[PDB]
Design a protein around this ligand. Sequence first.
Ligand code: DAN
Length: 628
Amino acid sequence: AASLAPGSSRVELFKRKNSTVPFEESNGTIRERVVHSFRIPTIVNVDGVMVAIADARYETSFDNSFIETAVKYSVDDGATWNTQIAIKNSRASSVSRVMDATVIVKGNKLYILVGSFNKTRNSWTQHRDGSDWEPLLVVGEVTKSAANGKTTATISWGKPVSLKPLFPAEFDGILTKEFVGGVGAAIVASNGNLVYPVQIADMGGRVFTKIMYSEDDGNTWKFAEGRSKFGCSEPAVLEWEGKLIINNRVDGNRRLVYESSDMGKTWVEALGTLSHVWTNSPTSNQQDCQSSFVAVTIEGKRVMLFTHPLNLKGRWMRDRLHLWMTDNQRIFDVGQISIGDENSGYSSVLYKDDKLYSLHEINTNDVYSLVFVRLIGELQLMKSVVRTWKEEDNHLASICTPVVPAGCGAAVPTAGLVGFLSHSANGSVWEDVYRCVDANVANAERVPNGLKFNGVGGGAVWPVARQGQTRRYQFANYRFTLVATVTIDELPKGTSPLLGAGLEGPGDAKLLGLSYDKNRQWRPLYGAAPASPTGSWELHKKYHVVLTMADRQGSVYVDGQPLAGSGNTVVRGATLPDISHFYIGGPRSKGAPTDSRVTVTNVVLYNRRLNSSEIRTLFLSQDMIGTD
Ligand SMILES: CC(=O)N[C@H]1[C@H]([C@H](O)[C@H](O)CO)OC(C(=O)O)=C[C@@H]1O
């Protein structure tokens, strides 16, 4: 949906210049105080109690102003709420502030880490030293009661404890200045560790991220050895299949995502899955924004949810908040959860008792409220998509493939299967069976499990960089396998394209691909190498084509055997390639008026290089995988 979906709705929960908080005076008296702006939302579930956490920016929405940490909590899924100030600021000056709450729930405890500042008027990364700052950890305890039918809850907040004595003065060379949590909901790892992703500023103002974790429920804390590149901030972390996945804010460039299998000791950029997929605006050169990144189980399948504005207006406007759902292979855009063209901002998502919610910013004139959203239409779509993913994976994995010399052979590969183009299509769209990235079609006619091309630019474009802002097939620049069943229907005049990966840039360079020629020979394309002919094919005969690329090496297989010239380097330099799209047939909107008379069916895309057993299995099961 292009806006909050039919069936969903929201309320303004923390209302700018309206909702009050129980401000505690120095003398201990409480006064209901109006709050200019509420920012930096997090919503979590603590033993059945929704707890919403926010910066209460009392006087202005500016970062360096008088701020305290507010909490609203509900025992009836948002029907009613109680309000508190969980963490007070130091009251040292007119701009004293506790801000940027990062939260972990473990049992009936909430662990909140905030940055506390006394008097600075400038931005944290630019301070002369860390003398105005303390990282404060606060523990809240949620207690539920039951009085003749009615359930109520209380939350007690402990005294803040400064973690400044535990912050090293240096990291491998780097002289430290300050750190804050990554903002939003953090995690308890499967081993019980409290895991905060942190953002650290060095003396010069460079920012980078790290994991800070505790093995003893916050009694002690350790900074793990790994770190992000410089320029990463506001990290969000979740645990996936035994690894921490750290998703970073990157002002002015695409978002970096890292994985660590050893509690943050070693970080590896997620080039094969999520790194550089998301970004800060269509042109990637704008201020970025915080994102929520949470693992949940929907319809029996573990998935990750990610929120971020499209920010088409740029700077801090942060219009058009979207929610994506991924299983680390496919990436589905659930849609826009903010309304129309409104400015949004920081966000949080919660899945609780089979209902989905969001708490996020709305901004008019830099006065901010937080809306509490019931994502009813969105959850319905998510469940449908997860059912599609499970049904197709289970179907493929259950195919009885032919036995090979060494009941059934090996399973049709489903691990890392990202996209599949098969029977469903129309005149302009070839549908991804996995519902994420369709291919665009021209001059085509439907055939079982695919399309027959006839006319100028007859073919399909499966966009890679051409997806635009959110690059869900960015993994292909690091590795991929592309598979298809093909027939050549008419001889070409000279050479004509069939299947491949095109590159952005001058001319019409290809990374890896296959063409065919008037002599009935194949013409594999291995990067920039002169594409000489090899082998032999016949008109009207079906052939299986597999292109593999990993470790900068490319191979082209026909009928399960590599063509001459395979197995060499196809990308030179150290710079990742920038694939524009996969082409199927001879699509084009300009240049030579290519017209490849071929029929292509069952196009499969994987985010890894399939092994020999897998390639053979696909070659032997071509008549078995189609959607019909
Ligand atoms: C401590 C602090 O300043 N946090 C602020 C953060 C920060 O200024 C930026 O990441 C540059 O370091 O920015 C934003 C923001 O809406 O973009 C809100 C945070 O409250």
